[PDB]
Design a protein around this ligand. Structure first.
Ligand SMILES: N[C@@H](CC(=O)O)C(=O)O
Ligand SMILES: N[C@@H](CC(=O)O)C(=O)O
Ligand SMILES: [Zn+2]
Ligand SMILES: [Zn+2]
Ligand SMILES: [Zn+2]
Ligand SMILES: [Zn+2]
Ligand SMILES: [Zn+2]
Ligand SMILES: [Zn+2]
Lengths: 261, 261
């Protein structure tokens, strides 16, 4: 049938999608800036579609409730037909690939440790062998699921602590986790994807850092509903953008050219 | 129909697939060892197939001849029906994804510079601004195509030199490129994937090293003929193996546990 405007679901996560200063009271795609905003414009150009950027209503990446079996987050928006594509830092995982389609990855990353500068922690193993410094992850995402599912001794030990810690060590958004590190006087460390860790390390007040290697290796992909005819073109477009060096240009633009430290 | 033994095409490239010592005169899959041999056994177990490992007849990864338009290498074995799957360090690229299917990546890598220790080169830009030290890549692969196609000033400059250099700066196999670095007294540098560079750096005689950052970011995938029904299960299997930490275990086993330096 006739061309239709593609509904894009995404999430407010710096530096992927951010509200431009003084654009809050305005309308349309032009309100937003970031790596994924630029990436959306390129995918749409190469695939030949018009699009509307929307922020996921529940502010979540996507997980399946064990009770209701209902998917939430951006994943849920695709699964239930509320959006046509997700262009966001959405991690490719087995349980998600069973219900939605993903392009080849547009960025690599791994889970990493964020600390307030001077915290006496260098590794996951260090966190796991002590009790003075609390630590946690984002809720409703792949990082939490990594720990929940791990059979690796250090990570299993970490999960056993995290799952029963009071008050909750989990946070609703990256920003909350970062604020909690900064206000903790060193007594909270945040487990998050290396991409966001590395970005925050380059922002004022320049009081956090990434420590240790990554805990795993994975990627973000552009997601479409299962069997969507958009998937083929989107996938080829990601591969073209990588080979043209466009994805590398965008990474430098939004991480390191914007550096404040 | 009835189950059939899956023909696996792969390539003799250390430490992915290697002939075991004293197994040359023997028969069957047990002759070979390496990261991809172990990976094949896991994919086959998770997908539920029996398989026969075969080494690609022409010893190439795969490129399309501009004249005949015929694909060679492992890609050609899939395209023309000679094999059912490729389990090898086969780089996911746009031109390949147009003719074969790839799983999500099982390993990340980038093009990198190998030098003989003491060579006064720290970067691609350094190579491009001088003439005393020759440099080249493997033929019939993604590294060569990267330079051929690049619009980035430094890489375009490098291609312009490489394509007309005499004697040829290209080599037939990784081993030839490595031997050429070692025998060059510093006057040849080899451009190759970071995975192989990092492996060689840990082997006797411990006279080479990787210098500088990677030139790009990409991945290896398991490849199947376009539209193959094996593709779905293979893809889910790669994602499972990554999440179980199996791929990381295999990397350490074949790179760093085997380290001789
Ligand atoms: N990017 C992740 C968020 C996280 O859990 O760190 C996701 O897709 O769930
Ligand atoms: N792994 C590469 C080989 C190379 O060109 O470095 C390929 O698939 O072509
Ligand atoms: Zn504006
Ligand atoms: Zn473009
Ligand atoms: Zn447990
Ligand atoms: Zn044996
Ligand atoms: Zn397994
Ligand atoms: Zn040129």
């Amino acid at each position: 049938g006739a061309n239709k405007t593609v509904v894009v679901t995404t999430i407010l996560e710096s530096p992927y999608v951010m509200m431009k200063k003084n654009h809050e009271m305005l309308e349309g795609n032009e309100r937003y800036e970031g790596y994924c905003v630029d990436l959306a414009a390129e995918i749409a150009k190469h695939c030949g579609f018009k699009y509307k950027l929307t922020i996921v209503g529940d502010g979540k990446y996507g997980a399946r409730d064990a009770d209701t079996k209902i998917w939430n987050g951006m994943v849920g928006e695709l699964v239930y037909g509320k959006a046509d594509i997700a262009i966001a830092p959405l991690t490719i995982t087995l349980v998600r690939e069973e219900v939605i389609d993903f392009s080849k990855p547009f960025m690599s990353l791994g889970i990493s440790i964020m600390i307030k500068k001077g915290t006496p922690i260098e590794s996951a193993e260090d966190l796991s062998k002590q009790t003075e410094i609390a630590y946690g992850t984002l809720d409703s995402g792949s990082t939490k699921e990594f720990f929940r599912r791990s059979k690796i001794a250090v990570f299993d030990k970490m999960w056993t602590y995290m799952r029963s810690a009071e008050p909750s060590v989990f946070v609703r958004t990256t920003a909350e986790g970062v604020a909690r590190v900064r206000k903790s006087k060193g007594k909270y460390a945040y487990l998050l994807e290396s991409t966001m860790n590395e970005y925050i390390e380059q922002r004022k007040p320049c009081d956090t850092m990434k420590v240790g290697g990554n805990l795993d290796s994975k990627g973000y992909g552009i997601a479409t509903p299962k069997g969507s005819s958009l998937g083929n073109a989107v996938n080829l477009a990601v591969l073209k953008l990588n080979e043209q060096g466009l994805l590398d240009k965008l990474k430098n633009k939004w991480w390191y050219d914007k550096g404040e430290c």
